[PDB]
């Protein structure tokens, strides 16, 4: 009875009248423009729904409707990739010869000589070599011809229209009440069992009935035309019996708990398929089936309407002293009580948590997809392997920064001191000086003992004293704990003794157990860790800890500090509180996000640089008939990556040869974008280094010239606000730097990968 559906009918009329009233959502903006600052403020506050109205119910309805709009955008984008892979690609040719054809799904027109970008990708096709891994995804799903991709493109467009109609329907026709959105237990149950659980079950069905038989024939050498269509494996049961004898016995073993007879298509092998280099599809079918059961079971954890289940409020209210562990009772006698008020009213707090966990998920996607390549012919497609890791590392970094940003927004806007009296949130704010001072110290310790040790190495090498360097041949720093884990995980499968007997091959060959080669190229081999890996990992620890320091200082001091005690009244996003108190520039929580974006970029650039160099140096390469591996950079990492002169020379200077010499070739676009990224980075520096007072005064003289010729505009030109200038600077800085690395990575790996 408590959980129920309740809505309003036609709460907002569907009229285009407000389309002709820009800034209608904001009281100040609704009056109209007087200066050019009005235009920027219109776009800056467009999606800040909690400033359009104070009604939480109306805000929540805007969130729900807008999410349908974003889903429609994703569906249009997904439809584009399937359509371009069905109409302007060499997918069919690539399926015939996966190891000798480069994927390509973008073809340019011939008007200004840009047709030179139509690279010779093989298969009698000319186009841009794609690095998104779409072909490897589609092959693993059993797709073999362009007609199936065309049908999926149509389905994506239809789904986009359905999503768009749902957003209009659930905002303009039937908008749920606020209490509908506050059903934590019902939402958690439905999204666990019904979204994650049923989606895993449905995909397990597709893998078992379609992907597994098609890929089994493909790996056996059967031609595309001789492989029956996916529905034939469902109708003709005898076909599935030949590939997997267990299908001849139907569903009887499943219902009798005799699941061991299904071991022929629900395998638990581990390792990689020797033919393709990807994970065994039968392994992933059992993985997703096990996930479906686990998620569906998790979906019956919360109490909705029948008494059975756990309650969020009771669980949070019980997590306090003295009900905690004896050494965990320091959280105080209030503990987690009162945190349920946060999730009742604060959308920003939930967005903060969810953006963090999308960063966690995307980081796990990046790390777990190269070491355990899940798609056929993905590991040996070096250009795709580097692109997939780099892309999902960058997505995670932005998501993490966004999580910190909206955590600070919650503190300024949604935090209520009355709800948090001696609870854990209140106690955390009350020893923020303890937390920040300790974090500042460990950042200094990490910086000295990670980066300054590289400077020690550079000076020793320049002095001609290699014996005094931190290296494998000098003063060694062996990562013994990481080396021990590699040995433990290798011995677990049989390759602290055999703790996972059921897995045949090593879970990942990066930990040891052997090498896999597919088309004369390494798919995965053990990744040895030495002094160079010890130094680079502690570089990551240093950069991450500093990025945490910038963001977490902003969140903990969003309400105020010893300098400006009333920052909460000033808001989340303000430029300063004047030149007084010595100068209070960039005290707002927004400016800590602005500074944290730079440190996230610095941290993640070294992460993808570490991956790119190490994989090229110690993993990727070609294998001859004798089993001898020659790597892409020939083992440079161990001796060259221990100094930043080696990074400058053997990584940046040496590996940029492809992008720097790409003119008059199919890779010339990457050369142009390489310069384009450099330009935007330098361009951003004037927004960051200067101030609007200079530019406003300069605009005064320019306005005078227009006034002299009676051509001055009524909308008075203004320099960008202080916050706006910072936002422009960081946006162009990150765009320029990331695009430069994007061109640098893709140009090199499309020529030598």
């Amino acid at each position: 009875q408590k959980v129920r559906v309740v809505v309003d009918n036609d709460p907002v009329p569907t009229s285009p009248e407000l389309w002709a009233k820009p800034g209608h959502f904001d009281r100040t903006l609704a009056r109209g423009p007087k200066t050019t600052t009005w235009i920027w403020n219109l776009h800056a506050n467009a999606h800040d729904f909690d400033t359009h109205t104070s009604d939480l119910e109306d805000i929540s309805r805007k969130i729900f409707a807008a999410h349908f709009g974003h889903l429609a955008v994703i569906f249009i984008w997904l439809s584009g990739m399937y359509f371009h892979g069905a109409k302007f690609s060499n997918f069919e040719a690539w399926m015939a010869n996966p190891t000798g054809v480069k994927p390509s799904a973008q073809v340019v027109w011939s008007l200004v000589g840009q047709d030179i970008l139509n690279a010779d990708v093989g298969g009698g096709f000319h186009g841009i070599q794609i690095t998104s891994g779409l072909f490897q995804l589609w092959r693993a799903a059993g797709i073999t011809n362009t007609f199936q991709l065309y049908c999926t493109a149509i389905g994506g467009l239809v789904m986009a229209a359905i999503m768009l109609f749902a957003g209009w329907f659930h905002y303009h026709k039937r908008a749920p009440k606020l209490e509908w959105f506050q059903n934590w237990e019902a939402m958690m149950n439905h999204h666990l069992a019904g979204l994650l659980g049923l989606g895993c079950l449905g995909w397990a069905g597709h893998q078992i009935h379609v992907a597994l038989p098609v890929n089994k024939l493909l790996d056996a050498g059967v031609a595309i035309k001789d492989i029956p269509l996916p529905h034939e494996f469902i109708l003709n049961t005898s076909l599935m019996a030949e590939l997997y004898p267990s299908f001849a016995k139907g569903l009887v073993p499943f219902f009798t708990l005799q699941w061991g007879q299904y071991a022929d298509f629900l395998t638990f092998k581990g390792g990689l398929n020797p033919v393709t280099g990807g994970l065994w599809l039968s392994d992933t079918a059992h993985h997703h089936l096990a996930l479906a059961v686990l998620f569906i079971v998790a979906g019956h954890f919360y109490r909705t309407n029948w008494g059975i289940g756990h309650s969020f409020k009771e669980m949070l209210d019980d997590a306090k002293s003295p009900n905690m562990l004896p050494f965990l009772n320091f959280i105080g006698p209030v503990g987690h009580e009162g945190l349920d008020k946060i999730f009742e009213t604060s959308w920003h707090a939930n967005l903060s948590i969810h953006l963090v966990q999308f960063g966690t998920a995307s980081l796990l996607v990046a790390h777990h997809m190269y070491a355990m390549p899940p798609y056929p012919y993905l590991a040996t497609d070096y250009a795709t392997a580097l692109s997939l890791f780099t892309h999902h590392v960058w997505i995670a970094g932005f998501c993490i920064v966004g999580g910190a940003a909206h955590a600070a927004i919650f503190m300024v806007r949604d935090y209520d001191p009355a709800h948090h009296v001696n609870n854990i949130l209140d106690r955390t704010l009350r020893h923020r000086d303890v937390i920040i001072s300790h974090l500042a110290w460990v950042c200094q310790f990490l910086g000295f003992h990670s980066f300054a040790m590289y400077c020690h190495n550079d000076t020793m090498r320049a002095f001609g004293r290699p014996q005094d360097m931190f290296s494998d041949t000098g003063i060694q720093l062996q990562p013994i704990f990481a080396q021990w884990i590699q040995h433990i995980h290798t011995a677990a499968v049989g390759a602290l003794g055999t703790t996972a007997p059921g897995i045949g091959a090593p879970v990942s060959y990066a930990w040891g157990g052997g090498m896999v080669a597919v088309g004369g190229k390494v798919a995965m081999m053990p990744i040895a860790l030495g002094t160079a890996d010890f130094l680079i990992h502690h570089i990551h620890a240093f950069t991450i800890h500093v990025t945490v320091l910038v963001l977490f200082k902003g969140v903990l001091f969003a309400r105020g500090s010893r300098l400006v005690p009333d920052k909460a009244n000033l808001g989340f996003r303000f430029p300063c509180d004047g030149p007084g108190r010595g100068g209070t520039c960039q005290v707002s929580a927004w400016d800590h996000v602005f500074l944290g974006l730079f440190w996230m970029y610095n941290s993640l650039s070294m992460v993808v640089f570490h991956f790119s160099w190490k994989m090229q140096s110690d993993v990727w390469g070609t294998v001859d008939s004798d089993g001898i591996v020659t790597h892409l950079t020939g083992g440079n990492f161990a001796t060259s990556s221990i100094t930043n002169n080696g990074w400058l020379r053997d990584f940046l200077w040496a590996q940029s040869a492809q992008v720097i010499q790409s003119y008059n070739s199919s890779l010339s676009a990457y050369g142009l974008m390489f310069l384009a990224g450099h330009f935007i980075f330098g361009f951003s520096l004037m927004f960051l280094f200067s101030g609007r007072g200079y530019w406003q005064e300069l605009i005064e003289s320019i306005v005078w010239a227009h006034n002299k010729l009676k051509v001055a505009p009524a909308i008075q030109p203004r320099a960008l606000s202080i916050v706006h200038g910072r936002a422009v600077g960081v946006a162009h800085y990150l765009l320029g730097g990331i695009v430069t690395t994007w061109a640098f990575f893709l140009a090199r790996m499309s020529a030598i990968g």
């Binding site: 285009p16 009248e17 002709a20 820009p22 008007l111 200004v112």
Partner: protein, 46 residues
Amino acid sequence: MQHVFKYLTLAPVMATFTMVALSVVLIMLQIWFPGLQYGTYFKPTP
């Protein structure tokens, strides 16, 4: 519908229409007459 027409006269909408139309004119000029250069405009093809 009168509100839709008023929306179509917005500065971003008109600027996008003007930039797209100007881009189309220049693009089609490259297709019809590629390689035009200073000292070559309005000269017959040899």
